Amino acid sequence: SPVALYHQLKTGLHPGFGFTVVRQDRFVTENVLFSERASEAYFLGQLQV
Amino acid sequence: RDPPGYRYAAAMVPTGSILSTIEVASHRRLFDFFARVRSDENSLY
Amino acid sequence: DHGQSDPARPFAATANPWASQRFSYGDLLYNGAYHLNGASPVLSPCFKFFTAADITAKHRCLERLIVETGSAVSTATAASDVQFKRPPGCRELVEDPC
Amino acid sequence: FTAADITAKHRCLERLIVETGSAVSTATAASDVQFKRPPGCRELVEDPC
Amino acid sequence: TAPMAWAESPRELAGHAPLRRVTRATRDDTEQAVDKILRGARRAPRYHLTRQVTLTDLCQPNAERAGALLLALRHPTDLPHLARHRAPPGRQTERLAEAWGQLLEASESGCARAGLVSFNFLVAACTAAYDARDAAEAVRAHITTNYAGARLDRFSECLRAMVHTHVFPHEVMRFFGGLVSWVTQDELASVTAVCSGPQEATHTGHPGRPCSAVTIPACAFVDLDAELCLGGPGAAFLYLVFTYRQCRDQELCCVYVVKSQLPPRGLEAALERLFGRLRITTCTYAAFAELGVMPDDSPRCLHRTERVGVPVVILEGVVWRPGGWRACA
Amino acid sequence: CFEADIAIPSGISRPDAAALQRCEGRVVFLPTIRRQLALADVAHESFVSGGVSPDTLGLLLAYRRRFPAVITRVLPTRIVACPVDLGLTHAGTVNLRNTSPVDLCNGDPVSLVPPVFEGQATDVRLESLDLTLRFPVPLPTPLAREIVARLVARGIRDLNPRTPGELPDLNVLYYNGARLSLVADVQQLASVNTELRSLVLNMVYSITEGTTLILTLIPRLLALSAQDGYVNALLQMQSVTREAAQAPMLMQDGERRLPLYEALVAWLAHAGQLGDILALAPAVRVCTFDGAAVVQSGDMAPVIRYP
Amino acid sequence: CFEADIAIPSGISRPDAAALQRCEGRVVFLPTIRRQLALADVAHESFVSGGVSPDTLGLLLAYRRRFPAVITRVLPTRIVACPVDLGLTHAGTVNLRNTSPVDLCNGDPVSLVPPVFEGQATDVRLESLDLTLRFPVPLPTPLAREIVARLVARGIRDLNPDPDLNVLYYNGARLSLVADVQQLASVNTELRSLVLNMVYSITEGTTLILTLIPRLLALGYVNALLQMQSVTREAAQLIHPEAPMLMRRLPLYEALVAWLAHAGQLGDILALAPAVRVCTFDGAAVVQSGDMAPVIRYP
């Protein structure tokens, strides 16, 4: 029962099965970007306000 | 759901003259694309 | 289809039978079609793994699939104190091989 | 009687002359009897008493 | 010359004056960039823009166009608390809980709330409800193929559940604006739209960016109840009315627009008439709001092409001037 | 400012044109929102329903319909009045000429009234072209709602004459000092019906289930009639409530509705808004920038949008 | 905008000058729109009428009679407040300060009297010059009306007492009404006079129609149409109130006059007509409590 598993897990009994922990970790990395001579077009317009 | 519409660029230079003067709304059922703007409208520009 | 074997490990069907199976406990807990969670803001790491609807919806052509990995949209945000589930407005563009 | 009004005054010989212009009453000159000043009414009698 | 001194505007200014009286290319742009600011500055309140971010679940800017009614959908989270009270006890107030949930189920809090119901999306949701069909369902075909029939059905179940329990579609869904420009990303949208002021004067162009035109097209030959069956030339007015069915049809939702020259103190009277739906006998139906003036009677147009062939009524010129909700009876 | 021009028809007179010169600041009711209009659409000859001139409860119903416009300026061939119901959007405050024995104060919402005072007069005649102009009397909504109540009840006393032929006044008011004597002249079936019809109708909708919970409190009110100086004043000497005392009933439907709250809302809508439905509600309120805090009778009251 | 510049009095303490600095974005009611006004004219000591500080009803009267102006810039030796009533509608966006519930992207804030919530909280006293400022609370019209009716509803039960009105979740938030303690005793004592005018105007309204309907339709289309749609509603309420109550055309008509006036005077006080709207842009779209919010002059 989920009430039983409370009394067990808190008190440090192993209730016959075990888990697999999953967690999603995020990193700030440093990148290198190669590019060829013309990889794009990139047309330019006319400003306004 | 509508025809490609009217060319305002063409007709800036017309190729001819309509010699009559009538009210074209009465003949509305004769045309493929009919627009009536009263004293100007936005789409023209 | 656990009548078959596991592509990653062909000699066995499931490692955890309580998860890898449809309507299995793990499936019920983490799959998104059921969404017990959804009321709560906190991210579920496992929501990525259990969700055939999401796993299936993709395409198969690796040509693309590698370029859309470089710029995936993360399911999380880095802007909260506890890692939340990525909200509706705004993109991340993480990398995310998993 | 009240003294909230009398209390609400100042006793400043420094100030005593400038609120003199302010008047310790609330009527207007266009009524029939002197009334209580309506809210629209604003005032600057010299109100000695 | 005489036609432009007035068009390019000096004479009024002169009267005012008399009273007082008695990298090269980038450089060119900077000079010009400056000129534009000065002229805009020298020149110079007929416009107001409200801007908001929402999801595309309900609503959806792209399906819609240049002239469209967007209605706000206040208190999504709230409503269940409201349902318990203000509803006579034998109303099964648990209906909404599921219905809003149901509407939501069909499709959390996150960081983009789903606000902004479009006018369109109401016409389809109540299409089968109000008593007309397939001119109304043509709008429903529009939304299923552009904006899901589930959400329409879920949202219709919510409208039924709301009109059921004395929490109305009004006291929710106030007017938001005219939809200037959406700017959407993925499931997100940033919708600019006019708080008030005239519509035709906004991004303008043929269309404000390249699709087509601008208009406040009622979207229904089913909506655009055009009053003034008997009328005299006058500025027409635009209101927003919700008509309801209280067991006559099982909580009917009718949503449409009325266009006639009557100042709201006269609309309540003409709304009393024209409805045989008054035989609710608890009390209440038909709320209305004025969308705004159309200070010219004539632009109401008869057309049917949009997005599918839809009955679309075009309204030429509008000055949204929104106002509040009044339904006491 | 979407001003509506009004073309003096022609005709006119040296003496009649001098009469229109002093009509600036007065109010006009136009039966449309227009740009081009005729002088005769504004005249009292237009107020005439089929064959008959409306009475003074009929005008209120006519001023209910159409739009009040305050004349701003009068030119040789046009009259400029900007329709307050719409074109009230001015940065500063169009001038209203106080025509009334009354005096505005500052902040007083101003609702209009057909001319109704014994010394009131206010009808204007123009002989060159047959037409006239009755200008409504501006008045604070507290006073204008007291008047309408007087006209309504007076027309209702008359529907059924029983008791002897000497009735109460109801024709006389007081604003500050200054007894104000209303004009008692005619009451028309249809004009009194609608005024009675909507009065009766709305006072019914203001009664709900939770209302009975309040009627329990009448004996409690009169307990306060007598031991507080306020609450003593509240109960007018001629108070039916006083004569109404000269209760829960169980019947609670599951106990979670909150009928008190719901009873207030219901009463507040229908019965609370009766000045407005019986008469035309204020659309303007006196505001004076110069800091003059009243408006003498006959002066120009700077006026700003709705209270 | 038409700014009106309120003149700070003579030397004020440094902690008082910092009290005013924090009052930018607060609503002031200014008695006249004169460009030059004093501070004492604005201060709450200027709301005294009958020799007393006004109750919640006496306040709501004044809020309907003077001009609210939001404070734009507070300067030492001035206060610059721009009246809400003046200028064109939908213009002069001036920032407010939110107090309590959120103020979403619209909804037309009403400025309701302070006592409805923590009473003295917001008194903002200035001791140096011996005056005080009670700033109204900017609540949306649907919620402002729900509250003000919610409290007079609670007020009457209290009048004679032997389902909690006081929870009132607004949108996502459940706004607590009761501050418990004796605040209710302070809240209820100020609504005391508003409750009575409400109780009176009801009891005086019913008994006046319940006497009039049976003392009318018995003297045409009046009769038929009246009893027609009133079936089991007006007439039923007539028998039931006449059951637990007592029962004169001449006093009737003269009391119908005096009630009809007093009634609409309460509808004016009440209904808290919105002063402004919120129309945001490049803004959060929900203004969190205590945060300046854009706002425009007409609903």
PDB file of C-alpha atoms in Angstrom, chain F residues 37-207:
ATOM      1  CA  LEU F  37     -29.800  68.264 -41.744  1.00  0.00           C
ATOM      2  CA  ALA F  38     -32.782  70.554 -42.058  1.00  0.00           C
ATOM      3  CA  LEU F  39     -33.788  73.205 -39.549  1.00  0.00           C
ATOM      4  CA  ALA F  40     -37.303  71.762 -39.285  1.00  0.00           C
ATOM      5  CA  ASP F  41     -36.123  68.350 -38.073  1.00  0.00           C
ATOM      6  CA  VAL F  42     -35.054  70.018 -34.816  1.00  0.00           C
ATOM      7  CA  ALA F  43     -38.146  72.180 -34.315  1.00  0.00           C
ATOM      8  CA  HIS F  44     -40.907  71.344 -31.873  1.00  0.00           C
ATOM      9  CA  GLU F  45     -43.082  70.672 -34.913  1.00  0.00           C
ATOM     10  CA  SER F  46     -41.000  67.512 -35.349  1.00  0.00           C
ATOM     11  CA  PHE F  47     -41.756  66.369 -31.801  1.00  0.00           C
ATOM     12  CA  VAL F  48     -45.369  66.117 -32.934  1.00  0.00           C
ATOM     13  CA  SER F  49     -46.421  62.471 -33.113  1.00  0.00           C
ATOM     14  CA  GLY F  50     -49.356  61.563 -35.289  1.00  0.00           C
ATOM     15  CA  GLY F  51     -51.615  64.588 -35.102  1.00  0.00           C
ATOM     16  CA  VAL F  52     -50.670  65.373 -31.499  1.00  0.00           C
ATOM     17  CA  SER F  53     -48.121  67.289 -29.569  1.00  0.00           C
ATOM     18  CA  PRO F  54     -46.652  65.197 -26.831  1.00  0.00           C
ATOM     19  CA  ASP F  55     -47.389  66.274 -23.261  1.00  0.00           C
ATOM     20  CA  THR F  56     -44.593  66.896 -20.809  1.00  0.00           C
ATOM     21  CA  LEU F  57     -44.142  63.201 -20.076  1.00  0.00           C
ATOM     22  CA  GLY F  58     -44.364  62.553 -23.817  1.00  0.00           C
ATOM     23  CA  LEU F  59     -41.384  64.813 -24.432  1.00  0.00           C
ATOM     24  CA  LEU F  60     -39.220  62.915 -21.938  1.00  0.00           C
ATOM     25  CA  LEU F  61     -40.028  59.840 -24.000  1.00  0.00           C
ATOM     26  CA  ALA F  62     -39.166  61.777 -27.147  1.00  0.00           C
ATOM     27  CA  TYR F  63     -35.951  63.070 -25.603  1.00  0.00           C
ATOM     28  CA  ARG F  64     -35.352  59.438 -24.647  1.00  0.00           C
ATOM     29  CA  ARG F  65     -35.265  58.714 -28.357  1.00  0.00           C
ATOM     30  CA  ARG F  66     -33.063  61.035 -30.586  1.00  0.00           C
ATOM     31  CA  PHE F  67     -29.805  62.797 -29.570  1.00  0.00           C
ATOM     32  CA  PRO F  68     -29.155  65.864 -27.310  1.00  0.00           C
ATOM     33  CA  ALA F  69     -26.818  68.264 -28.991  1.00  0.00           C
ATOM     34  CA  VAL F  70     -25.603  71.472 -27.392  1.00  0.00           C
ATOM     35  CA  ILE F  71     -25.400  74.376 -29.797  1.00  0.00           C
ATOM     36  CA  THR F  72     -21.763  75.556 -30.022  1.00  0.00           C
ATOM     37  CA  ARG F  73     -21.984  78.398 -32.571  1.00  0.00           C
ATOM     38  CA  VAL F  74     -24.637  79.873 -34.874  1.00  0.00           C
ATOM     39  CA  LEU F  75     -23.715  81.085 -38.404  1.00  0.00           C
ATOM     40  CA  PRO F  76     -25.789  82.949 -40.901  1.00  0.00           C
ATOM     41  CA  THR F  77     -26.882  79.834 -42.734  1.00  0.00           C
ATOM     42  CA  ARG F  78     -26.131  76.987 -40.324  1.00  0.00           C
ATOM     43  CA  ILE F  79     -26.282  76.038 -36.624  1.00  0.00           C
ATOM     44  CA  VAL F  80     -23.391  74.038 -35.217  1.00  0.00           C
ATOM     45  CA  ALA F  81     -24.188  71.616 -32.412  1.00  0.00           C
ATOM     46  CA  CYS F  82     -21.958  68.642 -31.538  1.00  0.00           C
ATOM     47  CA  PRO F  83     -24.003  65.567 -30.552  1.00  0.00           C
ATOM     48  CA  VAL F  84     -23.057  64.928 -26.911  1.00  0.00           C
ATOM     49  CA  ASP F  85     -24.333  61.359 -27.160  1.00  0.00           C
ATOM     50  CA  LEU F  86     -21.444  60.781 -29.595  1.00  0.00           C
ATOM     51  CA  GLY F  87     -19.174  63.693 -30.426  1.00  0.00           C
ATOM     52  CA  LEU F  88     -18.455  64.608 -26.831  1.00  0.00           C
ATOM     53  CA  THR F  89     -14.772  64.007 -27.539  1.00  0.00           C
ATOM     54  CA  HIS F  90     -13.287  67.435 -27.092  1.00  0.00           C
ATOM     55  CA  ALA F  91     -10.153  68.067 -25.140  1.00  0.00           C
ATOM     56  CA  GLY F  92     -11.770  70.762 -23.067  1.00  0.00           C
ATOM     57  CA  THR F  93     -15.394  71.032 -22.299  1.00  0.00           C
ATOM     58  CA  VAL F  94     -18.272  72.418 -24.454  1.00  0.00           C
ATOM     59  CA  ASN F  95     -20.309  75.322 -22.947  1.00  0.00           C
ATOM     60  CA  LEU F  96     -23.788  74.625 -21.633  1.00  0.00           C
ATOM     61  CA  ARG F  97     -25.921  77.560 -20.942  1.00  0.00           C
ATOM     62  CA  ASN F  98     -27.673  77.138 -17.650  1.00  0.00           C
ATOM     63  CA  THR F  99     -31.340  77.819 -18.328  1.00  0.00           C
ATOM     64  CA  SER F 100     -33.143  77.094 -15.082  1.00  0.00           C
ATOM     65  CA  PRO F 101     -33.877  78.692 -11.712  1.00  0.00           C
ATOM     66  CA  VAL F 102     -31.366  76.160 -10.378  1.00  0.00           C
ATOM     67  CA  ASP F 103     -27.593  76.307 -10.032  1.00  0.00           C
ATOM     68  CA  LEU F 104     -25.216  73.759 -10.962  1.00  0.00           C
ATOM     69  CA  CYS F 105     -22.367  73.537  -8.342  1.00  0.00           C
ATOM     70  CA  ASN F 106     -19.305  71.625  -9.488  1.00  0.00           C
ATOM     71  CA  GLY F 107     -19.418  67.994 -10.433  1.00  0.00           C
ATOM     72  CA  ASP F 108     -23.213  67.923 -10.665  1.00  0.00           C
ATOM     73  CA  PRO F 109     -24.223  65.545 -13.447  1.00  0.00           C
ATOM     74  CA  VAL F 110     -26.562  67.387 -15.780  1.00  0.00           C
ATOM     75  CA  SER F 111     -29.644  65.696 -17.184  1.00  0.00           C
ATOM     76  CA  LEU F 112     -32.148  67.616 -19.222  1.00  0.00           C
ATOM     77  CA  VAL F 113     -35.879  68.144 -18.714  1.00  0.00           C
ATOM     78  CA  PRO F 114     -38.700  69.576 -20.856  1.00  0.00           C
ATOM     79  CA  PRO F 115     -39.497  73.010 -19.659  1.00  0.00           C
ATOM     80  CA  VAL F 116     -41.470  72.385 -16.465  1.00  0.00           C
ATOM     81  CA  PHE F 117     -41.519  75.421 -14.131  1.00  0.00           C
ATOM     82  CA  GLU F 118     -44.322  77.944 -13.655  1.00  0.00           C
ATOM     83  CA  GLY F 119     -41.953  80.870 -14.240  1.00  0.00           C
ATOM     84  CA  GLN F 120     -40.050  78.595 -16.640  1.00  0.00           C
ATOM     85  CA  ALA F 121     -41.363  79.684 -20.065  1.00  0.00           C
ATOM     86  CA  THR F 122     -38.594  78.762 -22.597  1.00  0.00           C
ATOM     87  CA  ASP F 123     -40.586  78.288 -25.817  1.00  0.00           C
ATOM     88  CA  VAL F 124     -39.190  80.260 -28.770  1.00  0.00           C
ATOM     89  CA  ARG F 125     -41.091  81.345 -31.866  1.00  0.00           C
ATOM     90  CA  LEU F 126     -39.776  82.233 -35.310  1.00  0.00           C
ATOM     91  CA  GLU F 127     -42.410  83.798 -37.539  1.00  0.00           C
ATOM     92  CA  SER F 128     -40.656  83.872 -40.926  1.00  0.00           C
ATOM     93  CA  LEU F 129     -40.701  80.118 -41.229  1.00  0.00           C
ATOM     94  CA  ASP F 130     -43.214  78.287 -39.306  1.00  0.00           C
ATOM     95  CA  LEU F 131     -41.322  76.675 -36.517  1.00  0.00           C
ATOM     96  CA  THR F 132     -40.517  76.943 -32.847  1.00  0.00           C
ATOM     97  CA  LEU F 133     -37.890  75.729 -30.452  1.00  0.00           C
ATOM     98  CA  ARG F 134     -38.431  74.487 -26.915  1.00  0.00           C
ATOM     99  CA  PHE F 135     -35.171  74.178 -25.254  1.00  0.00           C
ATOM    100  CA  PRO F 136     -34.848  71.585 -22.508  1.00  0.00           C
ATOM    101  CA  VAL F 137     -33.980  72.753 -19.012  1.00  0.00           C
ATOM    102  CA  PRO F 138     -30.611  71.478 -17.767  1.00  0.00           C
ATOM    103  CA  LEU F 139     -30.745  70.401 -14.150  1.00  0.00           C
ATOM    104  CA  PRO F 140     -28.772  68.324 -11.653  1.00  0.00           C
ATOM    105  CA  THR F 141     -29.743  64.680 -11.806  1.00  0.00           C
ATOM    106  CA  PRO F 142     -30.807  64.738  -8.121  1.00  0.00           C
ATOM    107  CA  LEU F 143     -33.315  67.435  -8.995  1.00  0.00           C
ATOM    108  CA  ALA F 144     -34.236  66.134 -12.437  1.00  0.00           C
ATOM    109  CA  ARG F 145     -35.023  62.743 -10.911  1.00  0.00           C
ATOM    110  CA  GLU F 146     -37.170  64.336  -8.219  1.00  0.00           C
ATOM    111  CA  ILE F 147     -39.151  66.112 -10.938  1.00  0.00           C
ATOM    112  CA  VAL F 148     -39.729  63.050 -13.089  1.00  0.00           C
ATOM    113  CA  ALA F 149     -40.958  61.240  -9.993  1.00  0.00           C
ATOM    114  CA  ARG F 150     -43.373  64.128  -9.445  1.00  0.00           C
ATOM    115  CA  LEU F 151     -44.682  64.002 -13.006  1.00  0.00           C
ATOM    116  CA  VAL F 152     -44.938  60.214 -12.965  1.00  0.00           C
ATOM    117  CA  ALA F 153     -46.839  60.060  -9.687  1.00  0.00           C
ATOM    118  CA  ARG F 154     -49.057  62.986 -10.667  1.00  0.00           C
ATOM    119  CA  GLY F 155     -49.982  61.232 -13.891  1.00  0.00           C
ATOM    120  CA  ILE F 156     -50.566  58.087 -11.858  1.00  0.00           C
ATOM    121  CA  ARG F 157     -52.675  59.752  -9.248  1.00  0.00           C
ATOM    122  CA  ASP F 158     -54.911  60.762 -12.176  1.00  0.00           C
ATOM    123  CA  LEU F 159     -55.339  57.319 -13.797  1.00  0.00           C
ATOM    124  CA  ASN F 160     -57.823  56.417 -11.043  1.00  0.00           C
ATOM    125  CA  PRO F 161     -59.189  59.625  -9.508  1.00  0.00           C
ATOM    126  CA  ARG F 162     -62.751  57.269  -4.219  1.00  0.00           C
ATOM    127  CA  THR F 163     -60.962  59.464  -1.702  1.00  0.00           C
ATOM    128  CA  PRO F 164     -61.932  63.172  -1.680  1.00  0.00           C
ATOM    129  CA  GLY F 165     -60.887  65.702  -4.304  1.00  0.00           C
ATOM    130  CA  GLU F 166     -58.055  67.307  -2.331  1.00  0.00           C
ATOM    131  CA  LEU F 167     -54.836  65.372  -2.957  1.00  0.00           C
ATOM    132  CA  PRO F 168     -51.241  66.127  -1.868  1.00  0.00           C
ATOM    133  CA  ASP F 169     -49.101  68.701  -3.641  1.00  0.00           C
ATOM    134  CA  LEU F 170     -46.569  66.720  -5.711  1.00  0.00           C
ATOM    135  CA  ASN F 171     -46.484  69.783  -7.956  1.00  0.00           C
ATOM    136  CA  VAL F 172     -44.011  71.717  -5.785  1.00  0.00           C
ATOM    137  CA  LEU F 173     -40.337  71.128  -4.964  1.00  0.00           C
ATOM    138  CA  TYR F 174     -37.525  72.826  -3.103  1.00  0.00           C
ATOM    139  CA  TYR F 175     -33.948  73.078  -4.311  1.00  0.00           C
ATOM    140  CA  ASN F 176     -31.939  74.749  -1.544  1.00  0.00           C
ATOM    141  CA  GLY F 177     -34.444  77.492  -0.725  1.00  0.00           C
ATOM    142  CA  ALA F 178     -36.573  78.577  -3.642  1.00  0.00           C
ATOM    143  CA  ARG F 179     -39.886  76.764  -3.903  1.00  0.00           C
ATOM    144  CA  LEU F 180     -40.116  75.355  -7.421  1.00  0.00           C
ATOM    145  CA  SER F 181     -43.634  74.955  -8.786  1.00  0.00           C
ATOM    146  CA  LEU F 182     -43.981  72.427 -11.590  1.00  0.00           C
ATOM    147  CA  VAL F 183     -46.412  72.920 -14.442  1.00  0.00           C
ATOM    148  CA  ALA F 184     -49.520  70.784 -13.979  1.00  0.00           C
ATOM    149  CA  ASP F 185     -51.322  70.689 -17.305  1.00  0.00           C
ATOM    150  CA  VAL F 186     -52.160  67.545 -19.172  1.00  0.00           C
ATOM    151  CA  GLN F 187     -51.382  63.932 -18.769  1.00  0.00           C
ATOM    152  CA  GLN F 188     -51.792  61.619 -21.726  1.00  0.00           C
ATOM    153  CA  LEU F 189     -52.810  57.986 -21.537  1.00  0.00           C
ATOM    154  CA  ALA F 190     -49.900  56.660 -23.579  1.00  0.00           C
ATOM    155  CA  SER F 191     -47.316  58.905 -21.940  1.00  0.00           C
ATOM    156  CA  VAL F 192     -48.362  57.883 -18.432  1.00  0.00           C
ATOM    157  CA  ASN F 193     -48.814  54.218 -19.366  1.00  0.00           C
ATOM    158  CA  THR F 194     -45.222  53.615 -20.465  1.00  0.00           C
ATOM    159  CA  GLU F 195     -43.920  55.597 -17.499  1.00  0.00           C
ATOM    160  CA  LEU F 196     -46.161  53.508 -15.248  1.00  0.00           C
ATOM    161  CA  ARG F 197     -45.481  50.333 -17.215  1.00  0.00           C
ATOM    162  CA  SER F 198     -41.707  50.527 -16.802  1.00  0.00           C
ATOM    163  CA  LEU F 199     -41.965  51.710 -13.200  1.00  0.00           C
ATOM    164  CA  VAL F 200     -44.153  48.758 -12.217  1.00  0.00           C
ATOM    165  CA  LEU F 201     -42.105  46.374 -14.328  1.00  0.00           C
ATOM    166  CA  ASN F 202     -38.731  47.211 -12.790  1.00  0.00           C
ATOM    167  CA  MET F 203     -39.844  47.379  -9.165  1.00  0.00           C
ATOM    168  CA  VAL F 204     -40.979  43.768  -9.578  1.00  0.00           C
ATOM    169  CA  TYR F 205     -37.662  42.439 -10.877  1.00  0.00           C
ATOM    170  CA  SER F 206     -35.964  43.965  -7.830  1.00  0.00           C
ATOM    171  CA  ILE F 207     -37.745  41.429  -5.592  1.00  0.00           C
TER     172      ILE F 207
END
